[PDB]
Subunit: 158 residues, 6 copies
């Protein structure tokens, strides 16, 4: 059984994240979608809300498990018996930062392999931050989010 | 009548911004310089101060109108009957972020066309943030700002 | 304002990415010159006559586009055509760096010519005439990336 | 899942950077095809027969690697080999831009082939076969960057 | 006597910073390692703590002087009689920002020359921010910091 | 400290951007070697004898510059010249990526040679000898970017 972990803040999970986790499930037997509590980033949604939204949005994928965590990434990957860490590519700044995290994780857990996937062109210019900024100014973001997430975001801002 | 909108936080408007709006007035019949309230960025100058400084700095250009806004960018462009959105180029991080905003705006208002202009080499390495950081440590920033803006910045920090 | 804009390139061959950029340019300027380089440094796959005829047929539906071959310095041709706007597409970071170096050079050569950068549809962001030609030469499907007339001409060129 | 992955390139010659990437790929996929381009656009320093034999000897210790020459479009070969994973190494920003353009093209050509990007050790992040060959041609020491068999073959090639 | 200044926030000084200051001492007769108070960045360590840690970490290098400052960079360089400003290279975002600072400093002090050095591959993916993020989640950062700094960081988080 | 620095390149021809970098290097190091590559991969527009004479006349006002031709690996020449500092100019992001790959290679070849990167004036940030030559070949004005002697030599070369 090959196990992969797809970590992030997912505040909230977008169609870009759904695209990446879907591609990961086609490659690995079991995928853990791991949501960091991230209190320092002051998230819009609590960890419990982010886990519930991601569980609903990924329910149609049989080999995805959604979990919350506050541990060091490398420790949580070891403790989930995962040997693959999935990241999505986007911008240069993200890529250069992903290279720093991958080299750090290699020092913390040498057998944990960083794997980068490319999202569909459709979602290659979106992020949780951009969707929230548009929604805060009442712009239509229905195209970018799963249905349950779009309702939760509208309710949170209401 | 071809109408263009040049949006930003302009906190405060610099000679780099004057250069871009001047180039835009040579291309389009009417240019709206649109200042976002931007409370989340905690601006140094209030919106009323930023509008007044920009009005004084652009008074010599007959086809510029300075306006403040708190709306979604795409909605404000539609409501001003503009079909061109002017941006200035600077760094890679800015460019990659401009590409995300342009693709989002295309989803919100397909007929709104993002147009990128290049500032003079003279202003290609300045920003409102950099000028404010230098001024906060008493460095001479007279070369980078219109006269009225330089006086207002010195007064604000005094 | 009756603006004349120039959109220069080798267009070897013209792709849907080029059509996207020129269509956007016609929606903001009164007249657009699609300027095709006569003699690029590397021998083109299509001759200037073929490149011009392909671009003309592919832009015929846009009433304010003029397709014209040129052999001078791009800025010398733009000056003689009374163009005041120079159109270039920005696909990614590699485009951004190179285009900024050319724009500072063109501003030195012709200060009255303003460089305007447009963004193509996400559909054409990763394509270039070079990549399309390379894929087609190695027996890959490129139909989606080209106007029909160009697809037909490229198939005929690769058959021989 | 019994995944077949393809790691394509010119491998002219195979370096320790390539060995690093293929070793990581064998640690996550059941079978890895190290696919060597038969006829690149620029004449290679080593013939296809030399490139294949060097890569075979340098990967012989990895039981689930198969070294194979190919002349078709990379995606056409991957489809015929039943590969569902495409392996590429990402060294720096220049790699990132070019690889993203190729990945969108490969997804159009073969949607069932997923591009997976791996990162080499810091030890090999700045090297390429091109830089190694250029340094060695101008009498610089490149022993550290190559498997022993490749070091021997490169010295013999440069001696004549 | 050729004098160089190596400025930064050094919150805390890492092995990457030690590598850069060591390379600078091999090139220039006297190197001032200058620590900015940086209250706007809300540092983990006070300026007095950062100066003491850097003094201990660089004590083995005879031509390094550690000093704290709150002045404009260009003014502090002039006042130290330095004509060389040392920077370490890392990512594109850093490089583009270094180009803006270098062009600004050239306007403030034309004779002050910005010199960029490249750290060892060993430290090319680390930063003070990354080390602190790992340490805050109890990850082992002993490899990345001088001994005295590692003890101080563990004590600060305890 | 009596530092010897090396500033290598093809200098085909030397531009005001090169003069800017070498002038800054003379203001921080006791002796600067302006090292000109004898045999680059692509045939240069100017012969080594022409490149050397142009660089000598253009740097004659700087007393601590020595112009010297070299054909070895740059690091082998730097070692034999007792240089401990290697000077390179950083114009933009494309320069940054390539220069970092060369600096790690040079550190492996000659660990005692420290790579030092300088920034040119904003006036010369977008220029290269390649862009200047291309503009001049296509009848564009490049007088502003070159020392007077180079402007004269380039006009004479393009006239024939
Ligand atoms: C290769 O990918 C990654 O390595 N990471 C980093 C984690 C990140 C998710 C995240 C966000 C905010 C806080 C955390 C907290 C837990 C909480 N709450 N844990 C944590 N922080 C880290 C920072 C750096 C490194 C190397 N390890 C870390 N571990 C995690 C996804 C991408
Ligand atoms: C193509 O250019 C741009 O699209 N934008 C984005 C806006 C930005 C100005 C700005 C700053 C801070 C807040 C706002 C607020 C109003 C206030 N106060 N509106 C707003 N935020 C947005 C974020 C993303 C998008 C797609 N649309 C937005 N609309 C605007 C200039 C560059
Ligand atoms: C803003 O964009 C551009 O400026 N350029 C450059 C031109 C280039 C088209 C092209 C290709 C090959 C040869 C030429 C020849 C004509 C023929 N045959 N003229 C020409 N070469 C140049 C190289 C540099 C510069 C600044 N100006 C040039 N003018 C043109 C599109 C992108
Ligand atoms: C994801 O990576 C890649 O997609 N490619 C491209 C291939 C390349 C290896 C290579 C070199 C030279 C010629 C070929 C020839 C076969 C021979 N001989 N086939 C080939 N050329 C191509 C160019 C572009 C694309 C999308 N597909 C191609 N397929 C292959 C490694 C990196
Ligand atoms: C070429 O390098 C640099 O120029 N700088 C910039 C400084 C920076 C250190 C630093 C951090 C935080 C605050 C300061 C404060 C002092 C305190 N406390 N002074 C200060 N801020 C500045 C921002 C911009 C410029 C051009 N000059 C500045 N001078 C310094 C290292 C890299
Ligand atoms: C830090 O900068 C550089 O390292 N280089 C590389 C050299 C280059 C000048 C040059 C051009 C063409 C041929 C040579 C030939 C001599 C002749 N003729 N020597 C040479 N080639 C090399 C390629 C790579 C490396 C690492 N070392 C080399 N040494 C030199 C300036 C920028």
């Amino acid at each position: 059984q090959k196990r992969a972990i797809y970590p992030g803040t997912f505040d909230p999970i977008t169609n870009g994240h759904i695209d990446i986790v879907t591609r990961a499930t086609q490659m690995f037997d079991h995928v853990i979608l791991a949501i960091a509590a991230s209190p320092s980033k002051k998230p819009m949604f609590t960890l419990e809300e982010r886990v519930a939204l991601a569980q609903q949005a990924t329910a149609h994928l049989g080999n995805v498990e959604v979990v919350g965590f506050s541990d060091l990434m490398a420790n949580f990957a070891r403790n989930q018996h995962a040997t693959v860490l999935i990241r999505g590519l986007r911008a240069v700044a993200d890529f250069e930062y992903e290279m720093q995290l991958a080299h750090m994780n290699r020092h913390l857990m040498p057998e944990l392999e960083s794997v980068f996937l490319m999202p569909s062109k459709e979602w290659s210019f979106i992020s949780s931050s951009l969707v929230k900024e548009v929604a805060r100014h009442q712009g239509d973001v229905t195209h970018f989010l799963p249905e349950n997430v779009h309702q939760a975001l509208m309710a949170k801002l209401a």
